[model samples]
Target: MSADDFDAAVKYVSNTTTMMASNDDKLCFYKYYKQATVGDCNKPKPGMLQLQEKYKWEAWNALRGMSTESAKEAYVKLLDTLAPSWRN
Candidate 1:
């Protein structure tokens, strides 16, 4: 997607008040968001007790080859899948 679309999607996701995301969907969102904003999973892994954190970390780690721009595109596409009217 174009940079503007990516930015718009980011803004849409950020400003959204109520999200109806399942745990897995939330992980995908977290993954793309981290991939776009943070670039990589260079930090230490979450402790074993923190199952949710570990899963989110793994989700982000899975996109090792994705560029920030690509992650932004994926994020927007995911937004469309999750919230069809986000473009408005």
Candidate 2:
């Protein structure tokens, strides 16, 4: 898919707050979005005291070496699974 598709999906998720997507689902999108837009996790790992940041760090870190294209594709794919009619 093109960057436009990814951007559309990101907008959909950002605006449509009624879906009730789980925290895991949201985090799943976050990691892929970060990977897609910023590449791999190059920032320092969050300290143990920062629980949410730590999870975000680990999630993006786990996708190490993934290309931006792949990450973008995965982000949209997961969005489809989470909201099948998002494209409309």
Candidate 3:
């Protein structure tokens, strides 16, 4: 899926009660779906998807290990890394 499509799917799933209220397992699945769908793109070269996947894997691994602080830190770092170029 394109970035726009991914973004829309994330937003839609995130706002839904079933997804939003999900526990760790459900959230994990949703997160993977969001990343794969939103981050994947058929561009000429690697784009944000690749970068996002790097961070996503880091964060996912952190979460899997139950390292809450590390996961939060990874997410923060990702935000900072993308902030400079994020359009919206």
Candidate 4:
């Protein structure tokens, strides 16, 4: 993906949940984060680097079984669905 695409994705996730007002909302936000990042959201919690590694491996596996472009499109669509306001 392009730098713009990556930035938009990160911003989309961040803006969608960064200021949650309740415990439930915060938990929901982290659940979204775990799914988006594919990393544990708990102690010694794997951060962005680990998340990227997991994402890359999963993406690569998906592309190997299907089409890389289609996989990317799906990922982008998922991000849009999760953060609709960020979509154009």
lDDT of 2 by residue, 1-88 (tens): 5555888888878777578677778788889888887888899767878788877888999998888898888878888766768766
For every candidate in turn, the CA RMSD to the true structure comes to 1.8, 1.9, 14.4, 9.5
| Tens-digit per-residue lDDT, 1-88, candidate 4 | 5323544655655665543245333333333333444433233323565655454444333334333343334445556545655667
Where is model 3 more than 4 Å wrong at Cα?
A: 19-25, 29-59, 62-88
C-alpha TM-score for every candidate: 0.81, 0.81, 0.26, 0.32
State the RMSD for candidate 1.
Answer: 1.8
Consecutive 10-residue window with the lowest summed lDDT within model 4: 23-32
Query: In lDDT terms, how accurate is model 2?
Result: 0.81
User: Which lDDT values do the candidates have, in the order given?
Assistant: 0.74, 0.81, 0.38, 0.44
TM-score of 1: 0.81
| For model 3, the run of ten residues with the poorest summed lDDT | 78-87
Residue pairs of candidate 3 with colliding backbone atoms: none
Candidate 2 regions exceeding 4 Å error are 2-4
Residue 58 shift from truth in candidate 2, angstroms: 0.8
Model 2 residue 52 CA deviation in Å: 2.9
